[PDB]
Design a protein around this ligand. Structure first.
Ligand code: 6T2
Length: 296
């Protein structure tokens, strides 16, 4: 087996088929700021056949960029290209890699992160409807089932990183390569430092609690501290959210099995959520899925 080796995307040569002109691209208002790294609204001219002028977002390093930070961006780009495109993740459109700082052009989602959108329509939720919640839950499952398929572990699945595009299509992000999102991590991920696809299912069960309580902080009123860990190890789990059907809560509780092997697959989760949804939505989703693959 000296023969079979692991193909590490970050070593494979960059594909310049991606590369896009910098006089073709206009920067814009900042959308989000990372510790290092930032995103921006963008306008690209000639980037797409489908749209001559289109609205993007660009990821760029902050001005204080150590070189090491510089490679991280390229690696993410290489990881992105390798992953391929899927409907439920924020796809790569182009990148600028020569004669300047690196820019990765990503899809732009009009609504924004699920947390803000949910807060906005909390009142309108009887208007935002239960099916709407179910629609998102299904596409978070589908997107992840794609990600796991590529052996990609997100490590930070949550609502702030679920985005809602035009067409109410949810796109996940930051799936590409310390303070840790403790409320969202599986036990093995906190105690054992084990990050896997089965621990992203945990985070997903936390994401649903986020959804169905219409944007509620996980473990509200509970501050992470020694007692919090002593609770989680002992098996403590959040109660049912107010707006979640008995059926869905069952879905979370499955996601929070102390044993990882016991947690359902994303592929499995897509299925459970599909039977919670009108048949016409599954039709709507496939037509949209085809159309996306046909864009450009
Ligand atoms: C004008 C508005 C626009 O919102 C947005 C925000 C981000 C948008 C967006 C539209 N299209 C895309 N992205 C992205 C893209 C990549 C990201 C890679 C990493 C992190 C992101 N973040 C972090 C900050 C926040 N959670 C938003 C997502 C990213 N976002 C805000 O009202 C809608």
């Amino acid at each position: 087996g000296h023969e079979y080796i692991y193909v590490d995307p970050m070593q494979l040569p960059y594909d310049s088929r991606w590369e896009f002109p910098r006089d073709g691209l206009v920067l814009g208002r900042v959308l989000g700021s990372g510790a290092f790294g930032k995103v921006v609204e963008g306008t690209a001219y000639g980037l797409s056949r489908s749209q001559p002028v289109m609205k993007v977002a660009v990821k760029m390093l902050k001005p204080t960029a150590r070189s090491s930070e510089k490679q991280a961006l390229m690696s993410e780009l290489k990881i992105m290209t390798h992953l391929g495109p899927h409907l439920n993740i924020v796809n790569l459109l182009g990148a600028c890699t020569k004669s300047g700082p690196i820019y990765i052009i990503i899809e732009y989602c009009f609504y924004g992160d699920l947390v803000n959108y949910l807060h906005k329509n909390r009142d309108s939720f009887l208007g935002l409807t239960l099916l709407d919640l179910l629609s998102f839950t299904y596409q978070v499952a589908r997107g992840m089932e794609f990600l796991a398929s590529k052996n990609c572990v997100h490590r930070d699945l949550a609502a702030r990183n679920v985005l809602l595009a035009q067409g109410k299509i949810v796109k996940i992000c930051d799936f590409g390569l310390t303070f840790l999102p403790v409320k969202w991590m599986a036990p093995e991920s906190i105690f054992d430092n084990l990050y896997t696809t089965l621990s992203d299912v945990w985070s997903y069960g936390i994401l649903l609690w986020e959804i169905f309580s219409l944007g509620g902080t996980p473990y509200p009123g509970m501050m992470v501290d020694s007692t919090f860990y002593n609770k989680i190890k002992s098996g403590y789990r959040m109660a049912k959210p107010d707006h979640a059907t008995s059926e869905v809560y069952e879905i979370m509780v499955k996601c929070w099995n102390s044993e990882p092997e016991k947690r359902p697959s994303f592929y499995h989760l897509s299925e459970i959520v599909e039977n919670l949804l009108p048949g016409q939505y599954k039709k709507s989703y496939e037509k949209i899925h085809l159309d996306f693959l046909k864009s450009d």
